[PDB]
Amino acid sequence: SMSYTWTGALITPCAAEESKLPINPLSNSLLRHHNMVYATTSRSASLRQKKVTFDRLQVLDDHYRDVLKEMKAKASTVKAKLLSIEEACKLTPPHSAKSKFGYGAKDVRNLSSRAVNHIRSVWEDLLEDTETPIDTTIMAKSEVFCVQRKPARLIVFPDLGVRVCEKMALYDVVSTLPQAVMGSSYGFQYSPKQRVEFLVNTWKSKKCPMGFSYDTRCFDSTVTESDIRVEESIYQCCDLAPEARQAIRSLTERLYIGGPLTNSKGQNCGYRRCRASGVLTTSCGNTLTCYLKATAACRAAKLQDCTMLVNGDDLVVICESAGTQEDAAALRAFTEAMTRYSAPPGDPPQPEYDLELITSCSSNVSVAHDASGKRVYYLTRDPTTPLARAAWETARHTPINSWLGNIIMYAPTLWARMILMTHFFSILLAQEQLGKALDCQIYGACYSIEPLDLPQIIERLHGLSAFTLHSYSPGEINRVASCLRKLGVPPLRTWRHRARSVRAKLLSQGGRAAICGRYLFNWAVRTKLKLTPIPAASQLDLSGWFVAGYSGGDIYHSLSRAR
Numbered sequence: 123s124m125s126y127t128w129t130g131a132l133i134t135p136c137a138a139e140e141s142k143l144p145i146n147p148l149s150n151s152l153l154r155h156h157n158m159v160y161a162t163t164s165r166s167a168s169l170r171q172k173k174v175t176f177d178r179l180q181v182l183d184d185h186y187r188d189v190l191k192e193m194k195a196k197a198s199t200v201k202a203k204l205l206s207i208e209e210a211c212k213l214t215p216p217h218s219a220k221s222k223f224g225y226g227a228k229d230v231r232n233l234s235s236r237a238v239n240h241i242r243s244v245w246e247d248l249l250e251d252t253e254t255p256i257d258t259t260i261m262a263k264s265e266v267f268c269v270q271r272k273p274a275r276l277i278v279f280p281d282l283g284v285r286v287c288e289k290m291a292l293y294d295v296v297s298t299l300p301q302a303v304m305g306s307s308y309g310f311q312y313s314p315k316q317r318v319e320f321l322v323n324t325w326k327s328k329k330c331p332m333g334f335s336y337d338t339r340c341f342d343s344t345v346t347e348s349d350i351r352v353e354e355s356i357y358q359c360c361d362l363a364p365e366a367r368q369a370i371r372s373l374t375e376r377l378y379i380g381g382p383l384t385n386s387k388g389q390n391c392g393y394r395r396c397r398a399s400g401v402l403t404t405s406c407g408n409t410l411t412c413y414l415k416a417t418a419a420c421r422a423a424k425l426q427d428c429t430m431l432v433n434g435d436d437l438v439v440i441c442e443s444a445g446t447q448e449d450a451a452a453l454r455a456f457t458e459a460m461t462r463y464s465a466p467p468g469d470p471p472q473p474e475y476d477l478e479l480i481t482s483c484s485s486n487v488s489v490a491h492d493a494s495g496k497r498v499y500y501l502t503r504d505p506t507t508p509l510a511r512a513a514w515e516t517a518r519h520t521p522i523n524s525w526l527g528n529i530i531m532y533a534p535t536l537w538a539r540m541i542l543m544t545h546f547f548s549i550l551l552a553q554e555q556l557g558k559a560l561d562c563q564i565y566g567a568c569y570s571i572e573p574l575d576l577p578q579i580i581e582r583l584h585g586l587s588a589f590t591l592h593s594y595s596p597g598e599i600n601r602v603a604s605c606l607r608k609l610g611v612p613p614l615r616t617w618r619h620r621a622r623s624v625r626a627k628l629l630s631q632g633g634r635a636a637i638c639g640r641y642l643f644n645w646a647v648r649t650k651l652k653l654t655p656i657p658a659a660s661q662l663d664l665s666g667w668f669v670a671g672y673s674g675g676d677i678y679h680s681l682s683r684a685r
């Protein structure tokens with residue numbers, strides 16, 4: 123069937139749309155080539171509609187059915203809990219899209235009678251009605267990139283009331299089931315250092331390793347009605363409260379398999395018969411679907427000792443080499459099996475015989491050295507998008523601060539330390555906002571974090587070595603330097619000068635700022651201060667940080683205040 127059908131009504135914005143990086147003194151201090159930085163808008167939505175609209179041909183076989191039964195037997199061990207209305211309201215982000223039913227995210231979080239009554243009515247409607255398609259809003263996503271222009275991504279989501287109900291029925295399932303089914307292959311259970319460790323250990327565990335990333339073109343559009351029902355069949359293996367079982371059955375048929383599309387103006391926009399990007403099960407379902415197809419495809423291809431690492435549609439495979447000609451043919455057989463499963467490739471996959479040449483979750487393993495000169499593996503990425511987005515966020519107040527999430531997730535990198543930390547600490551110190559909590563995203567879930575708490579967060583996610591790395595690989599240094607020239611970012615010597623300046627001001631303030639000066643900026647001085655384990659690090663409650671993926675699932679993971 124067709125992934126989408128369209129009526130001709132346009133994908134519309136609900137406010138004015140900015141596409142150009144503003145000319146601002148603070149953002150200009152970071153990046154001078156402002157014309158290279160753009161934000162996607164609804165103006166390019168029709169180009170995306172063309173790309174994501176196609177017919178799906180899916181043919182399942184014995185390997186697919188065998189893997190499914192193996193996944194279902196593991197899913198059978200799960201006991202999932204129904205969330206109370208209050209527990210589900212607390213998982214809602216403070217700036218989540220308001221309901222069209224007279225209330226917003228703040229009313230949900232405060233447990234307002236109007237919010238609570240509506241949610242209860244939405245819940246009882248899911249229990250009673252197993253068929254009526256649930257309305258969704260289709261919007262063009264506003265995302266920042268560097269030129270060489272990508273058309274806007276399309277986001278599809280139901281009303282706030284429905285989103286709270288999804289949490290009640292499925293939050294516990296989507297948080298616990300993926301690891302029970304996929305074990306060590308489920309990427310979202312790993313902190314950055316655990317992911318690098320898993321990748322390095324799997325690579326080294328093979329006699330002669332061969333690895334590859336597999337890029338599925340428009341993954342969400344390739345997801346069929348059968349895939350979505352297969353996904354529910356795995357959910358159905360859980361021990362469930364009867365209402366959770368009914369809500370999952372009703373959500374599958376009324377929302378997950380497809381439904382009508384409405385624009386911001388309230389016009390009938392079209393019909394969806396594929397994955398919605400903005401529902402609770404997108405990350406979980408995409409991971410299960412990708413793992414299922416890839417595991418079955420590996421058996422059909424005759425790839426030897428396949429270890430998958432899956433995060434939604436992002437897939438990496440590390441196996442035992444059978445020889446170069448054999449590996450090349452087995453990879454072509456893997457692609458042919460994935461294509462039959464309705465997962466054709468975007469960029470054709472290529473076998474890799476070096477771990478550092480593989481990009482997975484837009485990241486590659488690199489090596490640096492700690493204070494002792496000992497080799498440390500860490501994950502890095504091309505810094506182009508992080509720097510373009512950090513520049514956008516310096517010029518405009520955004521609900522999500524990708525710069526903060528990038529400092530957290532990429533703390534050991536030369537670019538997060540020298541540029542990102544330097545730039546934002548300079549600005550926040552000058553604005554007396556170092557201790558002001560900001561929202562950022564980790565594996566799609568939102569968190570409220572004070573930049574002054576960064577040293578202890580970093581120590582837990584990466585180890586103390588994140589504050590001591592030096593002698594970065596020449597390939598890594600060159601990619602960073604070339605990106606800076608391309609974007610018109612000041613050279614690293616300027617960043618070292620700015621870091622020495624902010625470090626001195628941070629030390630002068632004492633308290634948490636002096637801790638930031640000591641740990642975050644020790645790289646900027648010859649006279650190194652002593653770096654010991656931070657007392658706050660061991661006390662940090664990082665439960666829920668590296669459990670599951672929640673991209674598009676409208677999940678807020680910071681603590682709720684009492685009432």
Ligand SMILES: C[C@@H]1COc2c1ccc1c2c(-c2ccc[nH]c2=O)c(C(=O)NS(C)(=O)=O)n1Cc1cc(F)ccc1F
Pocket residue numbers: 313314315317433434436482483484485501527528531532563564565566671672673
């Ligand atoms: C160890 C390295 C370092 O950082 C990561 C590592 C590994 C995986 C990571 C992140 C972050 C991440 C980066 C920065 C801020 N915050 C984050 O969470 C995400 C993420 O953004 N995931 S998501 C798509 O939003 O669910 N993923 C998963 C992911 C990333 C993709 F590029 C594509 C698909 C996919 F699954």
